[PDB]
Amino acid sequence: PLIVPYNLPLPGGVVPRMLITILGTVKPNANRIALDFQRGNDVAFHFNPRFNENNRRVIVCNTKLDNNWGREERQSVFPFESGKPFKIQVLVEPDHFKVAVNDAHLLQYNHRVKKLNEISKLGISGDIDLTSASYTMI
Numbered sequence: 001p002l003i004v005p006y007n008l009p010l011p012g013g014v015v016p017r018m019l020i021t022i023l024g025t026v027k028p029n030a031n032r033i034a035l036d037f038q039r040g041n042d043v044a045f046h047f048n049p050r051f052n053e054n055n056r057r058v059i060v061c062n063t064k065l066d067n068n069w070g071r072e073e074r075q076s077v078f079p080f081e082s083g084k085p086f087k088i089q090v091l092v093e094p095d096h097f098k099v100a101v102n103d104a105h106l107l108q109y110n111h112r113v114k115k116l117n118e119i120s121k122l123g124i125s126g127d128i129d130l131t132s133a134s135y136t137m138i
């Protein structure tokens with residue numbers, strides 16, 4: 001039963017074969033969730049499920065550099081459900097982040113920030129009850 005927003009340090013940055021697992025429950029009437037992999041003030045990977053963008057559900061992914069957002073990558077497959085428990089897994093691969101939700105592959109995000117060892121914090125925010133956030137090496 002962790003506090004949101006939650007900041008999870010990633011000691012020494014991310015590395016290929018690192019697996020991050022987030023367990024929680026989506027609040028009723030949730031509007032948004034966000035995972036922010038941070039390199040200092042920059043956001044290397046922003047993963048942003050939106051439950052009502054013009055009455056559509058969409059996942060927006062982006063990178064923020066020098067306080068400016070880049071080109072969005074959008075995914076219309078939406079596995080989250082208001083009120084229900086979820087599992088997000090982020091596997092770091094050499095050329096992308098690989099995201100699975102409830103054990104089903106969802107998307108890959110090509111690395112725009114290439115100093116992977118400097119991506120050393122994960123922020124978790126939005127309309128969820130957070131149960132656990134951890135990492136391991138596979």
Ligand SMILES: OC[C@H]1O[C@@H](SC[C@@H](O)Cn2cc(-c3cccc(F)c3)nn2)[C@H](O)[C@@H](n2cc(-c3cccc(F)c3)nn2)[C@H]1O
Pocket residue numbers: 032033034046048060061062069070072074125126127
């Ligand atoms: O990009 C990423 C950014 O977006 C902006 S909103 C502006 C664009 O969404 C508009 N737009 C559409 C398009 C486009 C591109 C292709 C197709 C198409 F149809 C449209 N191009 N630009 C949003 O404020 C940003 N944010 C979210 C949060 C946040 C904080 C706490 C909790 C939480 F859950 C989230 N903090 N900052 C972050 O999410």
